[PDB]
């Protein structure tokens, strides 16, 4: 109900899923979506398409919150990480900055066998 109209949009892109959170210029989240937010269930969730529908959903949601001009934060890697920024530009929100924030460690935690 806030009429926010400018703000942050995050793409957290996994190998398994893509989630997109919209937020206000100090960072508190307006709305969000994901692949399972829409119908898609399993593997289907991490497709690029699903990334795109997620982008679009969250955008439509925030546009109804009042959004237009939106600076982007990418975290993650994987199918339609890119396709979600592609559907974000395509939204009818103005993509202002695009910025890749993916956290990397300066190397302290051991990972899962899966991961070395």
């Amino acid at each position: 109900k806030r009429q926010v109209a400018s703000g942050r949009a995050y793409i957290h892109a996994s190998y398994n899923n893509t989630i997109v959170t919209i937020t206000d210029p100090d960072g508190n989240p307006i709305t969000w979506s994901s692949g399972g937010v829409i119908g898609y269930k399993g593997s289907r969730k991490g497709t690029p398409y699903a990334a795109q529908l997620a982008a679009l959903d969250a955008a439509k949601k925030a546009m109804a919150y009042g959004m237009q001009s939106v600076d982007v934060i990418v975290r993650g890697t994987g199918a339609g990480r890119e396709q979600a920024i592609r559907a974000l530009q395509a939204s009818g929100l103005q993509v202002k900055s695009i910025v890749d924030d993916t956290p990397v460690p300066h190397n302290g935690c051991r990972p899962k066998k899966k991961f070395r």
């Binding site: 990418v74 900055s97 695009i98 910025v99 924030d101």
Partner: protein, 70 residues
């Protein structure tokens, strides 16, 4: 796009306090720069490392930054 030594004067390689020169050795992100691109020598680059690390620990230099466009 030739190297960074190629554009610069005598500058202390041990000056941890001199940011203006040192920044010019790092990535668009925070990452200290490869030799291929800083054009130093082994001993040179190896010193540029320890200095940069020193200055970082001192707050006048980035440990990491955010990557722009993409």
């Amino acid at each position: 796009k030739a190297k960074v030594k190629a554009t610069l004067g005598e500058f202390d390689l041990r000056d941890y306090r001199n940011v203006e020169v040192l920044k010019r050795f790092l990535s668009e992100t925070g990452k200290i720069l490869p030799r291929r691109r800083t054009g130093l020598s082994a001993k040179e680059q190896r010193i540029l490392a320890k200095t940069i690390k020193r200055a970082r620990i001192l707050g006048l230099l980035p440990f990491t930054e955010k990557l722009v466009r993409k």
